[PDB]
Design a protein around this ligand. Sequence first.
Ligand SMILES: O=c1ccn([C@@H]2O[C@H](COP(=O)(O)OP(=O)(O)O)[C@@H](O)[C@H]2O)c(=O)[nH]1
Length: 477
Amino acid sequence: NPNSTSKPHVFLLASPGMGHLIPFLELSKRLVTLNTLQVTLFIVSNEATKARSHLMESSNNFHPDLELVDLTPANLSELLSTDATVFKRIFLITQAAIKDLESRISSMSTPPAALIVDVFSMDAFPVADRFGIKKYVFVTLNAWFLALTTYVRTLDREIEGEYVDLPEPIAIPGCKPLRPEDVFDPMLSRSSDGYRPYLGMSERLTKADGLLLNTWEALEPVSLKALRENEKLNQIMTPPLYPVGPVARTTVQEVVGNECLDWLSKQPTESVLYVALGSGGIISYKQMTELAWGLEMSRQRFIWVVRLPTMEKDGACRFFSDVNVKGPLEYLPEGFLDRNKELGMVLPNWGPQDAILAHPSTGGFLSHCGWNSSLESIVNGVPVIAWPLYAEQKMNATLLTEELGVAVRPEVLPTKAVVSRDEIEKMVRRVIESKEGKMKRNRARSVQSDALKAIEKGGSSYNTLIEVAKEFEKNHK
Ligand SMILES: O=c1ccn([C@@H]2O[C@H](COP(=O)(O)OP(=O)(O)O)[C@@H](O)[C@H]2O)c(=O)[nH]1
């Protein structure tokens, strides 16, 4: 109908990584379901995978007014080959897409009403500025991370020497102090190639017209209050703050024909441990051997997502790929798959995590505590074995364990020492079979209740998302 009113158009931009794409897909669907917004999500990826194709295909059929556009640049072998951390390469790949984004915006009769980018994608800000587009960052991390990020440029001036050498916890104004061993990966060495980019991220976030945050009032009342009211922090991070979390898959729709899920439905309630170290997590061959034996020795049911072990060229994580279909199985102990066929299912590379964590037969989650995975454990009330590896996962693991009370963790960080099969067996038993595990599942359940309330009608995050969506609507005004 050419005489019908057109909805205002919101653009989103997600950088490489399942942990950026998945929450951006969920936010995009939440926005479009308000029935007042045209939504286009531009996706930048590191490579083609079956997992990404299925995610994209599902989403591009969700709603008429929701569109997905693949902006992955066509000549990535050079950028992926850069001798740099995955963290830094995410920036480099995203930068290689900005010109194409600007091309898309220029061809439009009317510019988008808003642009929402992730923390790796703020090189799109000049594009927004040229077209008069309000720019928002969807910070897909938690408030504690946002506080640290707000204040890290001050920390850079005030602390001499390495953060990891400091004697006591790092004060963050108004907030829980940060243990030196828990600092965000780029802070682990001030000579790392991600440390300066992180300082730049800190500065550029202050230039946003608004910040959407994947947390909720009931989860992080102290950190949100510090961000909002502590002069040391609200003097720096001036943009308006919108907690809209949990932005996470909270409806899983029935799957026909999935071998994993069909098997899971045959297991007893709360009996299966899901084991998956995100999309990017990798472990050494030696650690993989201990984990395999730990799971076998526990005699608990499990679903274990495995990848190729760490190689010489690997850093702290690995760009997600699914072309090594069978290779990861080659690094299990001889006969493992057949020896554990009654209780254990091993999946190379990718599993249906949303459906598994929502399944009533799942009893626990051995997680690397990436923030999306953490949220998926919370929205489903699943207790956690915390196994942080990279990014801000050590902070997340501490949040889950010390503040929420929903997690068990090894004595020593897995990045500092191999976790033995004996400790693993003990952790798995504690979470799945023991009375302590029932207590942490009940705690998780309690946390879940307030998380779901936040995004249901009338919840704090639901209303905050409405408020944000009205700013986009007024931008059109
Ligand atoms: O086998 C897997 C591994 C990961 N995921 C999903 O990929 C995302 C990983 O994001 P996260 O923030 O936990 O960590 P990342 O791997 O990006 O560091 C989550 O939404 C996972 O549910 C999945 O579906 N299947």
